[PDB]
Symmetry: D2
Subunit: 258 residues, 4 copies
C-alpha cells in the first residue's frame, strides 16, 4: 500500500551505494514502485544488475547520453518490457575536471563548455523527448541540480552554467509535456560525498561549511534526497511541476559564515 504502488520508474546515475540514485531507488522500492536502471559501457552490467536485484528488479539497460542511438535504443528496449513509463530519474552531470578546479577562466575552453552542457543539461530534455511516446498520462520526470546554478560557488565553475541551463530545461519541459499531463521537476540537492568528489579539493570544506551553517546544522543524506525524489515522482505531487525543490538542510536560504 506504499505511495508509489504499481509505478514504473526508470533510474539513471546509480554508480554506487553513495549515489543519489541509490537513495531514490531505496525510497521508490519501499513505496511499491517497480524499477529499472541504466548503465554506461558493457563492462558495468554485472554491477548495475547486482544493484537492480537488491531492489527486486532485473531490468537494466545501456545508455551513454553522449550518443543519440543509445538514447533511442534505451527506450525501444524498455518498451519490450514496459508498455508505459511512469517515472524518470535523471541524475547525471559531468564536466572535464579542469573546468571545475581552480579559476573559472583558466579551466574554460570551448570543448570543456560543450561537453559540460551536452552531458549535464542537454541529456535531460533529450531523455524526455525519447521517453515521451511511452510515458503514461500522469508521468513524472525528475532531474538533479545544485545550488551552484543559482549562485557562484568557488570551483563549480562551468558546471554552474550547465546546471542553470538544466533548471531552465525543467521549465521548458514542464510547459511542453504538461499539455500531455506529464510533470517535470528538479531537486536541487545539498552536497553528497561520492567517489567522484575525492578529486574535488574544496569538498571537505563545503561539507563542513554546510554542516555548520545550514538551518538544520547537518549535511543532507541520500535517504532525505531519496524520499523527496519519491514524493516528486508520486501522485502526492501531482500539483507540482516546473519546480526546483531544495533538499539541502535549508542551506540555500541563508547567508552562512558571518
Amino acid at each position: 500500500m506504499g505511495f508509489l504502488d504499481g509505478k514504473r520508474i526508470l533510474l539513471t546515475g546509480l554508480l554506487s551505494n553513495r549515489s543519489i540514485a541509490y537513495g531514490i531507488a531505496k525510497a521508490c522500492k519501499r513505496e511499491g514502485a517497480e524499477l529499472a536502471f541504466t548503465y554506461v559501457g558493457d563492462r558495468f552490467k554485472d554491477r548495475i544488475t547486482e544493484f537492480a536485484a537488491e531492489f527486486g528488479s532485473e531490468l537494466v539497460f545501456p545508455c551513454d547520453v553522449a550518443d543519440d542511438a543509445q538514447i533511442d535504443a534505451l527506450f525501444a528496449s524498455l518498451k519490450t518490457h514496459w508498455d508505459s513509463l511512469d517515472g524518470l530519474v535523471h541524475s547525471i552531470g559531468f564536466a572535464p575536471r579542469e573546468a571545475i578546479a581552480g579559476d573559472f577562466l583558466d579551466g574554460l575552453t570551448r570543448e570543456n563548455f560543450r561537453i559540460a552542457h551536452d552531458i549535464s543539461a542537454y541529456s535531460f530534455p533529450a531523455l524526455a523527448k525519447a521517453a515521451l511516446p511511452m510515458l503514461s498520462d500522469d508521468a513524472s520526470l525528475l532531474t538533479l541540480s545544485y545550488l551552484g546554478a543559482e549562485r557562484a560557488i568557488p570551483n563549480y565553475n562551468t558546471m554552474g552554467l550547465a546546471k542553470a541551463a538544466l533548471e531552465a530545461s525543467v521549465r521548458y519541459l514542464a510547459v511542453s509535456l504538461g499539455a500531455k499531463g506529464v510533470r517535470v521537476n528538479a531537486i536541487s540537492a545539498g552536497p553528497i560525498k561520492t567517489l567522484a568528489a575525492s578529486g574535488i579539493k574544496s569538498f571537505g570544506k563545503i561539507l563542513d561549511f554546510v554542516e555548520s551553517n545550514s538551518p538544520l546544522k547537518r549535511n543532507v543524506t541520500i535517504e532525505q534526497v531519496g524520499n523527496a525524489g519519491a514524493f516528486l515522482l508520486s501522485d502526492l505531487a501531482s500539483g507540482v511541476t516546473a519546480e526546483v525543490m531544495h533538499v539541502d538542510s535549508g542551506f540555500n536560504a541563508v547567508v552562512g559564515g558571518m
Copy 2:
C-alpha cells in the same frame, strides 16, 4: 502503515470543506496523524467542531491570532491533551476587503496595512514561539502563501506585501528553530468560491499553467502532509510551489 503515523498535528485556518486546511487535514488523517483545530470565536465554534468530528477529533480551541493571550492559552490547553506537538499548519490570511480590491495605492491605509501584516504574517512566527516549549525536536511547521508575494498580481495588493513578510519569516524561523531539528516551510499554493475577478484568475491559470488545470485542495493537502512528515526531513526554509507550474511561466502571450 501510513507516513504520518502517530504524528500530532494542529491546524489553524479551517473555514469550510473547501479550505486548504481542509485538504491538508484530510491528507494528514489518511496518512495516520492525530489532529487538533483552532477556531476564531464562538461564531465559528460549531463549524469547526463539526469538521474536527469528521476527522475523528475532539480537540478544538479558540484562537484569534490578533490576541497574544489567546495564542498562549491555545498551547496551554493543548498541553493538557498532548505532551508534545509534531506539526503546525498555518493557513490564516486576512486583510480588510478594501485593501484587496481596486488599486493598491488608492485603497491603502496604515490600519489596513497594520491588520494584514498582523494577521497574515506576524501570526506564524508568533504561534511558532508560543508552541516552542512543547514542540518535538523533529516538528514541522507549514505556512500557506501565494505568488502575489513574488510578483505583483492585480488586486492582491497589501496581501502581496504581507505574504512576502510571511515567506521571509519562513526563512528566519528555519534558522531559529533548526538546531533543535525543527523544520519550517511554506506552500505557495495556486488559487482554489465565486468572485468576478477570481473567476478570471482561475480561467487564466487553467489556460496558461504548464498542466492546464487549477490545483485542488487534495494536491495541496498531499504536498502539505509530505512537508509535515519525516519524508521531508531534508527540507526546511523552502517555499514550495503547488500551483500546476503556474509561477514558472509567462502566461497569456
Copy 3:
C-alpha cells in the same frame, strides 16, 4: 548639463554625512538636481538645515512617518515651494534593538514586529500616496533595502521580514503608479560606528564579495542618482543590488 538637471528631489533619512541618504544627495546635487529634506524632531532641525545648506537648499520639513498628519502636511508644505516633485528617496528603516540582535524568536513581540513593519515598510507607499497629487508624470521613487529580505542573515531577524514586504511594495507601487509614468525601484545596498557583529559582516563581505571590497555611500549614491534620472526611464519594479556582487555568491567555503 548633469543628468538630473532641473529635477526636484525630496530625501528622507539624512542623519549624518555617513548616511546612504547623504551619498545620494551628493550625487544628485553633482548632477544638477534641486534637493529638499525631511527630518524628525525639533532637536534635529538645525543639523538637517545645515546639511541642506551644504547642498544649496533651504527646504527642510518635519515628518515623523509614524504620523499620518505629518505625512500629509509634508506635501501640503512642499507644495507651497514646488509645483511638482520629480524624485523621492526613502531611506528610513527601524526596528527596536532587541528585534535585531540575537535569536529571531527571542526578540519577536507583536509591538516589535508592528513597529518595524510600520516604519520600515508601510511608510514607503504611504509617502508615495501623499505625494501623488504633486508627482510629475516621469517622477521616480527610490527605496533602500538589504539582502536579509532575500535570505536569512544572522542578526537581521525582524527587519528581514520588513524589508521583504518593502521589496514587494516596490512591485505593487510600480503597477499602481506606472500608467501615469512614475517609476519605483529599490537599491539593495550592502553594509557601509558601533556593532561587533557588524565588523564581522564587513570583513566577510570584503573577503568574499566578487569585488573584494565593501560598497561606499558614493557608489550607492551614484546608483541612486541614476535610478532617479531619465537614464533609467526603462527601469521600474526593480531591486538593484549595489553590494560589490555579494548577493551573487556562496562565500566562506
Copy 4:
C-alpha cells in the same frame, strides 16, 4: 563632462540602427566614450564602418565567435590601437530557427542545443577570457539576456536554456575577474523590434502584451536599454557587479493578463 569620459569600449552585435548595441553605442558616445566595433563576415565590413564613422570611430574588426582564432585575433588587433579596454558589450545570441519556434521538444536536437549555447552563452566568458590581459583596473563587461532565462516564454525554448547559462556566466565571470577590479553584469532587456524578430511569429503578440501589462504600459526603447548599458559600463556603477538588471518597463515583476 560625460559620465563615460575617456572610456574605451568595444561593442559586438551592432547590425543596424535598430540593434540594442546601437542604442548602447549611442548613449556611450554621448557620454564621452571612444568606441570600437565587431562585425561578422566581409560582406558587412562596409555597413559597420559607416556606423563606426557615425560614432566618430574607424576601429572595426571581424569576429565570428564560433571561431577561437577570430576571438584571439580580435584582441590582438584591438591591442595595436588601444593600450587597454574599459568596456565590453556582448550582444549576440543565436539558435537555429526551429529551436525557437513551436514546441520546445519539436526543435530540440543535440546540434541545435550545441549551436545555441556555443554562440549565445559560451561566447561571453570566451570574449572576456581573450580580453583579460588588456582589461583596465576598472573595466566593465556587459551582456544582454532576456526574461526567457527566468520563466518559460512560449517560443523561446532552446534560447531560454542558453540565456540561463549566460546569466550564470555573469556570476562566475564576476567572481573570476572581480579581484582585479573588473565588473560583470547583464541587462535583461524587454523585447525590442528588429528585422530579425519579424519573424518569429509571436513577436507582435509579445509586444502588445508587454504594452498592456507592463507597469509602465509601454515597450522598452533601445535608448532606454542603451542608457542603462551606459550606466553599467561607467564608474557610476562601480558598486554593481554580478547583476542581471531588468530594463523592460517592469514587465518581469508582474503577473500580466489577469
